[PDB]
Amino acid sequence: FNKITPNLAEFAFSLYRQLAHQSNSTNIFFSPVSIATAFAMLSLGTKADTHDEILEGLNFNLTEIPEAQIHEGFQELLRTLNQPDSQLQLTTGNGLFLSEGLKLVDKFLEDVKKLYHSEAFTVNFGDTEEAKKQINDYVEKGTQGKIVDLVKELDRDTVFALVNYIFFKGKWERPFEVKDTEEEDFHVDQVTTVKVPMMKRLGMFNIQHCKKLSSWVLLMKYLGNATMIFFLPDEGKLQHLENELTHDIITKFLENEDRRSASLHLPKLSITGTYDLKSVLGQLGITKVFSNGADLSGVTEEAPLKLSKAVHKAVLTIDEKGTEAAGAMFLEAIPMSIPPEVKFNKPFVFLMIEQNTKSPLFMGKVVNPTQK
């Protein structure tokens, strides 16, 4: 079970570590799962080196894992995320926009819609401004107005664009009380603070100090099928934490059933991340599909084709409760002993895990909550 989860985890860390190297003073936030799903889907229209580069760039060793197991893993993961009764409030979409003058292969359009429950559209790229409006209107409608004007430019030679979006609003299983949120200091570096809204609660937490990561490690469950893992590095240990993360360390944390008291301070947060996937995935080895030499003959047989534009935007909120409705009133028994004070009041890393598949839905780093 969950055959592709180790690969997605390695993809998350590969992509995270690239972005953390190219800029160390900005927030990072992206969805490993939604990017990987989009490009696994795209690979169904590619062949030969173009195809192999895509799946290898998603951390699949094609000498070891059969391709059927790759797509089966992605389709199972999509089953759990796009399910009717979910409390997770996770919406993701992927739009393919292809020049209306191309003769498209029906098999590819069928695979996209049927297997990957995604959307493909024809557009007139002879009108660059209107094509961009249509792409941005699609994303804005798909996010009920939350992501606007996603694509800012299209080269005149564009004939194929890909947009991938995801937005998340969660409800903690064990919520904070809004009355307890107050302004507190956030240490953006060792001598500087800014004021930010800080939630707090005294509770029984899946929390531990981890010597291997030199970090506090907090796991908090959402209503629905996911858990957020928060990593708080010890003084001067942020880089060490980023270097030492591994999938097996994460698995051990998810199996922990011990709970201890803590006085938790956690910032409210509105975070977004926007990335040019041609640039970012190019650094991970995915280059041919973006080049004139691209083998996209599963998309269109007669005419040349390349992917000219590929954009990812991820949006997430962290707040106290996420609903005016009263849920199950979980009562936690707090011992008569001093709880550790665990304050997420300096740069920290986080990772959201889907409960069934253990897949990495989001990864990010907060260097300043109000960097906005």
UniProtKB/Swiss-Prot annotation:
Q: Which GO terms describe its cellular component?
A: collagen-containing extracellular matrix; COPII-coated ER to Golgi transport vesicle; endoplasmic reticulum; endoplasmic reticulum lumen; endoplasmic reticulum-Golgi intermediate compartment membrane; extracellular exosome; extracellular region; extracellular space
Region feature (RCL): 322-346
- Spell out the subcellular localization from the entry: Secreted; Endoplasmic reticulum
* Tissues expressing the protein: Ubiquitous. Expressed in leukocytes and plasma.
Q: Where is this site: Reactive bond?
A: 336-337
User: Which one of the record's GO molecular function terms can you name?
Assistant: serine-type endopeptidase inhibitor activity
Task: Report keywords, A-Z.
Answer: Acute phase, Blood coagulation, Endoplasmic reticulum, Extracellular matrix, Glycoprotein, Hemostasis, Phosphoprotein, Protease inhibitor, Secreted, Serine protease inhibitor, Signal
Q: Which Pfam families match?
A: Serpin
Please state the protein's primary subcellular location: secreted
- What happens on changing residue 45 to E? In M-Mineral springs; causes reduced AAT secretion
Annotated site residues ((Microbial infection) Cleavage) in this chain:
306-309
Q: Which residues are glycosylated?
A: 24, 61, 225
Q: What else is known?
A: The aberrant form is found in the plasma of chronic smokers, and persists after smoking is ceased. It can still be found ten years after smoking has ceased.
From the record heading the sequence, give the disease linked to this protein: Alpha-1-antitrypsin deficiency: A disorder whose most common manifestation is emphysema, which becomes evident by the third to fourth decade. A less common manifestation of the deficiency is liver disease, which occurs in children and adults, and may result in cirrhosis and liver failure. Environmental factors, particularly cigarette smoking, greatly increase the risk of emphysema at an earlier age.
Protein name, please? Alpha-1-antitrypsin
Q: What taxonomic ancestry is recorded?
A: Eukaryota, Metazoa, Chordata, Craniata, Vertebrata
Q: Which gene encodes it?
A: SERPINA1
